[PDB]
Structure 1
Amino acid sequence: ERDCRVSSFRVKENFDKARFSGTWYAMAKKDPEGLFLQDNIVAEFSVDETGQMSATAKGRVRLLNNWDVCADMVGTFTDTEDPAKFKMKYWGVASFLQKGNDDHWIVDTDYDTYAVQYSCRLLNLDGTCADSYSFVFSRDPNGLPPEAQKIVRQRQEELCLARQYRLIVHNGYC
């Protein structure tokens, strides 16, 4: 029944930045081709007076051949016609870490407990994603409440990414 084509994905109606700001702990990730950001990923989102969102991040990274650092990132959200969809230009502090420009969309959030972010870097000829990534976000490093857990799972399914995610640990690396 449900569609798997990008342009169909729902997003957070009336997305509010302000409300969003703050610390978010990554509980689950759905890796894209060429994984970066391993685990212990904590993100600190903000917005300045203009209405411009931005954020930093931090987590383990597994460089080539086993060499794991504690990266520190920087993103800067470029709006779009739709409130929940942003163009995110990111880069790390160390000129050697990864740089890019990725679509960042807020699929769903309640602002105070969980969030579900989505990103599709390369579409297929059929409209489905050929290279995507997801983040389940939790305002608490211990998990979300059974109630939040439920919509979140509902959400992972609407993105046709269910049971594709993987638990994100916070064992204290960073």
Structure 2
Amino acid sequence: MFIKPGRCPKPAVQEDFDAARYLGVWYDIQRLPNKFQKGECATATYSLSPGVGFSVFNRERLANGTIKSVIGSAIAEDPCEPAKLQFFHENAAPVPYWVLSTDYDNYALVYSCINLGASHAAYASIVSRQPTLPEETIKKLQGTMSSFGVGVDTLLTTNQDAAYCSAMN
């Protein structure tokens, strides 16, 4: 199910989060089933913004081979909680985006949850600075997710194959 029992959890986020080091390209390695990703090879690119926060450009490769993308803006509405962001994507209502853990140069774990009464809808992603990530790191991040009730066996492994994804350039 996309909708799960219980209200949203409140996991810990990355201490001393530094958005400048978080900028650049991230590859989707695993993610919870969701409605927005329609393809494979997903990347997120975060870039400087003349205003506050940073800009967002997400791209994926659809089955027909076309590259589909969305633009957005990311802002931490409380400057004292810089890892707790609101993402504003074109044609979407705002969604939360929490950086739960990152070392900036290899991996990040991101989490988002919206309450639906006594249920909730959550999204989570393990991302990497490369199209792959070591199994040891994946299992560690999955452990973090399990610790607050995420169904890790539901995680999808994103296709990042070099040939299949060549159209991403």
The verdict on a shared fold, with TM-score over 0.5 as the criterion, is yes
Q: CA RMSD in A?
A: 2.4
- What CA distance in whole angstroms lies between the structure 2 residues aligned with 1:26 and 1:119? 15
Counterpart in 1 of 2:109? 116
Question: Shift of the alpha carbon at 1:131?
Answer: 0.7
Counterpart in 1 of 2:47? 46
TM-score, normalised to structure 2's length? 0.79
Q: Tell me if structure 2 keeps the 8 A contact 1:108–1:117.
A: yes
Aligned equivalent of 1:164, options 142, 154, 162: 154
Q: How many residues align?
A: 156
Counterpart in 1 of 2:72? 75
Counterpart in 1 of 2:3? none
For 1:165, the aligned partner's letter is L
Change (3 A) 1:35 1:68: farther
Question: Shift of the alpha carbon at 1:52?
Answer: 1.7
Aligned equivalent of 2:140, options 128, 139, 151: 151
For 2:56, the aligned partner's letter is A
Question: Shift of the alpha carbon at 1:39?
Answer: 1.3
Change (3 A) 1:149 1:43: same
Counterpart in 2 of 1:138? 128
* Unaligned segments of structure 2, at least 5 residues: 1-5
Identity %: 24
Where do residues 20-31 of structure 1 align in structure 2 (5 Å cutoff)?
20-31=22-33
* Unaligned segments of structure 1, at least 5 residues: 92-97
TM-score, normalised to structure 1's length? 0.77
Change (3 A) 1:120 1:69: farther
Q: Tell me if structure 2 keeps the 8 A contact 1:113–1:148.
A: no
Q: Tell me if structure 1 keeps the 8 A contact 2:59–2:68.
A: yes
- What CA distance in whole angstroms lies between the structure 1 residues aligned with 2:142 and 2:115? 24
Render the CA deviation track for 1:124-155: whole Å, top value 9, x for unaligned.
42xxx6111111101111x2224422321222
Counterpart in 2 of 1:95? none
- What CA distance in whole angstroms lies between the structure 2 residues aligned with 1:45 and 1:145? 23
